[PDB]
């Protein structure tokens, strides 16, 4: 017999795994237990601080719901108005020298006149083969000359992606990215560049919320903290390292063991295979790919320049820089960095140079958040990446020569975003049902693998409907159906449903 | 305060209540009822036997399940191997003297030379305008020209679905026929053309299983009985005559009254709105279409004929007889019509004459059902209708002037097709979140009157769905999805889920 | 026995008849002779003068030449280069307070924006529609929408070519416009869109040459020079009354039979058959359409405007003139209006008011030709057209209200424009192959009926073309395949052939 | 100076040379005169006899003409109506042991079902293909596929053309063949599949004429019969082995010198270019393609089998026979092979056996007259082509092994076919022009290369048009526009014309 028994585990409390205990917390049927080898939940929805007092989240996160049951969590753990800020999302592409509103494609009309004709010239050719095409695309970039023509596919998808994924457009599949990719149609792109005009509102996140305090990592504090605390175990007392599928017992660190009847486990997929001891899994997973994701800080002295204005989140395509975007985080909130009293000296100008007085001044601060890519196809330097990082934001003129650096923040995510490759769902089709048939439920960003599920609400609702699946025989349709899921509000699943108004008399 | 309360009232014991009620039983939480003006459940998917002893679904009822949960409810209520009957799905097209297998495009090489030609010669303009489409079709009509051509239209699926919707087909939007794209397999019809070869769309794999007994209705009293009794209340006094929706309070036809928190009404939602004396949905559930179905059964001494055989059922797009569709119900079970040792007289012979004898004969005896549509648009003469049909058989070579008719059946069932009429989707979206605000689920063929998701099993899981709703959040998938289930398994929801298994 | 004999009799001594003459004197083969009404040659290619000094040809005329042939009967009758004046081909279109560079849809840049909009979105259109397009069009406004889309359709080709033919765009024929795939080039015209660029098809290469003096009139009087005179008869005493077909014989008005053993007839078929006294042919010949011309003409005090400039000619869609193109005929030739020292009275000005004084005043001058339109679907008054037109001229600020107006000049031509209707070909089929019978060869601009073949150069070739089959055996290539012949360089005959090459030695 | 002086010398004297000829007489303006290398003119439509007594032209040869001056040559050289014989063509192709009506590609009703569905399943893909092509085909290959789709490229039109062109279809261009390769209609072949009927009646060939006695030589003799033997010269002596381009002066194998001022040579231009020593026109002819011929004729003992009918000529796409194609030359005059009581002995039979009896017996007799290509790119055995043949005509069911062959006949022909190779306009348009601004006028099967064009009656009216373009300034139409005259009735130009009836006043 084993140390505890329960008839669910969960394994891992980033949001996917909250999302199961929140749903299994609820149902308050079938026993269960929650572990993490971090103390403090949240995976790569967490908080980092740096010595100065400068918040950076694991790169630009901003959140936008497609599911009621979501908010409701959000709303039950931050239940204040203050508890949160509002913004629209304002963000741009650096290209030539300048800021061309976000989504690139659709604003043609801010370029260079020689620049619009190559443009429009190429989405003419698209827009005449799209009107004979009897076949889908195949690939990411046979999606986007087919849908953007080669002129905005050179200019600004083809360089822009590989620095984001970290391999080639030609390398990934495209049934991905209907909520991504904004396709321009022609008449309207034209439209804007004979008008002069701009079309900056596509997308699901063209409006955010971010939370007050402790930055996004903040939020799966507060919904972790809703949970039965004896029903939790967070920190190295939870570390998984073996898992018995056959004798269905979990393995913790200090050896401590756990029987379940079903698993439901949000750690990356290739190290449950290696936990699993399972050979077999192995070899699958390892024909998956990801790409890392190196975080770097940098905190500015200074009230926010006029340059930089109300600024959220911005892309950038071209060569002058290693990071492909850059968040304004201390437009999200006022808490993100130290107030404007605190007293820092000086680290470092921006042109690289030693400042001119080693004693400590006031602020007031901004901070700025970047992110750069690495896979074995895109080799990073790691010694020098903050620094290349510090002369970017000199050479794309988001900081002064002069500007004055007060903190640096750089931290490496090895597994930071899981690529759709053309063999991804080949490869899934193998491994998912292979543990399903084990009765593990293997879920979340890298747990299933799936970006286009993969944000935190994506992420929290794979645990919450894998329980749904598990107790009450739902649909897996985040899982399963993508497209589905994101294309519609879901309403229906909340956090208090028929169940307990009924129960509750 | 009202004589009965209960947490979910479920107005109804076709497959759709049932469902509901199934869903119930098996979360074993809210407290429930259900209700149906009729002693036996099973509404249109109920059975009717003459004095003879024939057999008569309410038209031809042929199971395809998309779904496990429907699955594990039929073989809880009739789990016996012999409870059941296996067969292909042979159908066929009665056209120009000769029975076209279906589908009739893939086998028109029976048809005469020059027809061939028109049709082919049809169908390449449509492969060809199919090529360079970048339209949906908007109407029924639309829609089968493109995937046809209009020869192949002009001989089948024309004039075969106006006898059916009694409706043109100008006049129904097609979305409800699913997301594949309107066009030709050309090459596939040239060849069996050029091969002068036939081929239906059925084999070993491609079957139903029917009921040993009691017709698909003896399906539904299986099913009922599985319930805890004293939570039914089925006959005159189980029948709804008034729906207070802000009271949320129910009155039967006896006086009694019962509350609800939330009600599931499987009854066609035109009677709902005038249950509930709201004028505002009276005006609209009218501005919905439905067409009434007659139909009439025909009990023959005899063996099967040779000409008859395998033939499950059958289509009839030409106006030489007045039903659409004819089902060899004797081919389904043994026990729809009596054993061959059984002695009745014969009535009339097939060309209407008087028999030689009155006296009383043994079969053994076979049986055909019949379906004939009646809407405004398209009136039926119910006086004369049997006679119609029975003429209608000697025409299409069913039946000879010869047969000995040994029993007959006729019923008209007023709400028998929805109508999926252009005008359909613009009236439902106002009807039934008038009805969600008010906490009333309705659900089923006239429940919520989608005819793509209206046969038993989508009627069914659109009352076990309603309830997941209700009480576990999910989302109601066939109401508003139905090509989403109808184009996989849906094997997720069993009727023992981990919720049961870990309680126990 | 009639008076007297020929070969090759040839009526009319227009371009058509000239050219049938120049070739038979070429030929000096079969005996000829070519009769006119008019004592001066030339026929629509004439040129009238008003007694103030003001030259006008029958409206614009602006030499095009196909042919090797025509260009050495031109250099022959007028060789030496002051002969001559050299001009680029400049023409633009009047359109909303614009003078829009021709051809009009590469110009749209000069249109307000949301105009631009309009017609590029119609444009769009056209060229998705030309993508899968497997049907050539049936009329003139279906090959104008498939070439421009609807919006420059609208502004341009529809309402210009309604008062060009005074009949509707669909009702006329779209063959006569040659082969070219009906479609847009859309790149091209969305290209000076977003450049915001103007460019008219002109230039040093793209030129035209006009006669230094008397006009295009000019031309046609010295060609018919070069011919033997006492092979010409030219007058009343040149006028044919009555054709007999039957006896090939022609009567002149003062009572002259010419006999013949082939007719090449270049006078309007319609009075053709009228001649002949051919009641048949008479009813086919009633069955075409044409319309007539009213060419106004106004002579003007002052150097030339520079919002006039180098323009040649004029195109006037809009309804606030009545006339449909116009020529700044003095910009063709100095000698098509008075020296500066010539003095003349001012009639009128502009807005129709009367000069300050009535004694004359010196030049320099400068000079309008114009040209109107009817038909039984579209009426003139000819009473008002004159003043109409001046009206015109200020309303498209062509001219001031102060201008001073010193010459003015009308003259109706009934038979204008041959027109391309749907029934145009049914009825020629018809009424050419039953004169062929007969041996009489009916050519020309209405000898023959047929616009895109019915240029001064065209016509010329027609009657060359006939002689060489009456003689030689030779393709009427230009009657019978406009397409061919405008689409190639003639350069094969010449006005020394082999023929008389050999012959001389 | 030279010992003769002609105005214009024609070199040659096949169909093209004596249409050059017979225009030049016509006219009866500049001096001229012809020569041959040959005593009898002809050329590639000549006719040999076996000392047995079978005739054998070079091939088939089936006279259809466009022109209607052509027609006036024969008609005068050959008046009588017992001088030919009128045949309507029925033509089929050898295909899996069946006769299939030509076209096969709108007889696919004809083979087998299996082969049906190939062959239509072929030409629906290329039908759906055809309805959104924007592109010509570039290609021979392209075209076939892109027209009739695989299945039937495949069967027959692929390895057909192998066989005759001696050259892959991917090697040659597909602007030639508006009148040699019918394309099929996917409605009227699958109506005729459907109801089992055939099209026989295609092409420009589907009636023909043929002289009763000499075989088509007979009609080039009794044509050069109507020129003045004087300006002749047939033979070793009208031999041409040097042309001085400069001097216009050409040299004969004799010594004799002969000036002109206008050349127009019909030999093939490649002897053209080596007999003017110039290296560079050497050069670009060698740049040309051209398959040789060779005709095997068989006599056969018997009266006409029943197996034979009334057959003229036979396809053959199939490997087990060398031939591509058989006529039954005896179907097209009695003349064309020795009468009935005529006494031969049996050279050998079918099988490839001696009969050992050397007795002559009678007929009556028929006859077959094969063909088979020769090029760089397939050799031919010349040492046993003809048993090769004669083993062909038993596979295909042509003679049985106990046929009696009673004469045999097998020549080669150098220069057979000019192939339109994809290299060949590129090249005649360096070639052509070159000789034409020296005076020469090359024309002709291989005078200027060009096989759509390359008929006999075709090749006459090239000598002709050559002629009138140098005397009369005529444009060169068969030439430059093979379309063009192939597509309509060419009805002008006769062999008395306006000029000679006018002069004979």
């Known amino acids: 017999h084993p140390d505890i028994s329960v008839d669910v585990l969960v394994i891992g409390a980033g949001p996917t795994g909250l999302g199961a205990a929140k749903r299994l917390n609820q149902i308050d049927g079938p026993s269960w237990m929650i572990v993490d080898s971090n103390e403090t939940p949240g995976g790569l929805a967490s908080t980092d601080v740096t010595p100065e007092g400068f918040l950076y989240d694991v790169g630009g996160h901003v959140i936008f719901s497609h599911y009621k049951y979501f908010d409701d969590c959000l709303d039950e753990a931050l239940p204040k108005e203050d508890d949160w800020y509002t913004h629209q999302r304002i963000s741009y592409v650096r290209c030539q020298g300048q800021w061309v509103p976000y989504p690139f494609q659709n604003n043609i009309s801010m370029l260079p006149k020689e620049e619009q004709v190559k443009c429009i010239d190429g989405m003419i050719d698209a827009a005449l083969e799209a009107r004979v095409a009897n076949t889908k695309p195949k690939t990411f970039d046979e999606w986007i000359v087919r849908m953007m023509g080669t002129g905005i596919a050179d200019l600004f998808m083809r360089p822009y992606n590989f620095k984001v994924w970290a391999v080639p457009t030609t390398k990934m599949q495209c049934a991905w990215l209907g909520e991504r990719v904004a396709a321009p149609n022609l008449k309207a792109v034209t439209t804007n560049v004979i008008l002069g005009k701009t079309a900056g509102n596509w997308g699901p996140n063209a409006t955010f919320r971010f939370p007050a305090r402790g930055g996004t990592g903040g939020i799966w504090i507060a919904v972790a903290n809703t949970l039965p605390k004896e029903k939790t175990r967070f920190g190295e007392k939870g570390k ?266």
């Open 240 to 505: 998984v390292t073996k898992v018995n599928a056959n004798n269905k017992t979990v393995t913790l660190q200090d050896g401590t063991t756990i029987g379940y009847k079903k698993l439901v486990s949000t750690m990356a997929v290739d190290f449950l295979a290696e936990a699993m001891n399972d050979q077999e899994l192995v070899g699958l997973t390892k024909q998956l790919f990801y790409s890392s994701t190196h975080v770097i800080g940098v905190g500015v002295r200074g009230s926010r320049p006029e340059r930089i204005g109300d600024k959220c989140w911005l892309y950038f395509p071209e060569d002058n820089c290693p990071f492909y975007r850059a968040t304004i985080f201390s437009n999200y909130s006022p808490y993100n960095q130290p107030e404007a009293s605190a007293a820092l000296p000086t680290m470092q100008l921006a042109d690289g140079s030693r400042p001119q007085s080693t004693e400590a001044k006031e602020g007031p601060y901004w901070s700025i958040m970047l992110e750069v890519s690495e896979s074995s196809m895109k080799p990073v330097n790691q010694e020098t990446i903050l620094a290349d990082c510090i002369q970017g934001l000199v050479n794309t003129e988001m900081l002064k020569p002069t500007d004055e650096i007060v903190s640096t923040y750089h931290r490496r995510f090895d597994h930071g975003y899981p690529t759709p490759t053309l063999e991804r769902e080949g490869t899934l089709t193998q491994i998912l049902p292979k543990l399903q048939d084990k009765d593990i439920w293997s879920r979340g960003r890298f747990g299933s693998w799936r970006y286009e599920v993969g944000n935190q609400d994506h992420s929290f609702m794979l645990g919450v409907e894998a329980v749904d699946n598990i107790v009450n025989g739902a649909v897996e349709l985040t899982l399963n159906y993508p497209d589905f899921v994101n294309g519609r509000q879901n309403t229906e699943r909340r956090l208090v449903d028929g169940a307990q108004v009924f129960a509750k008399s």
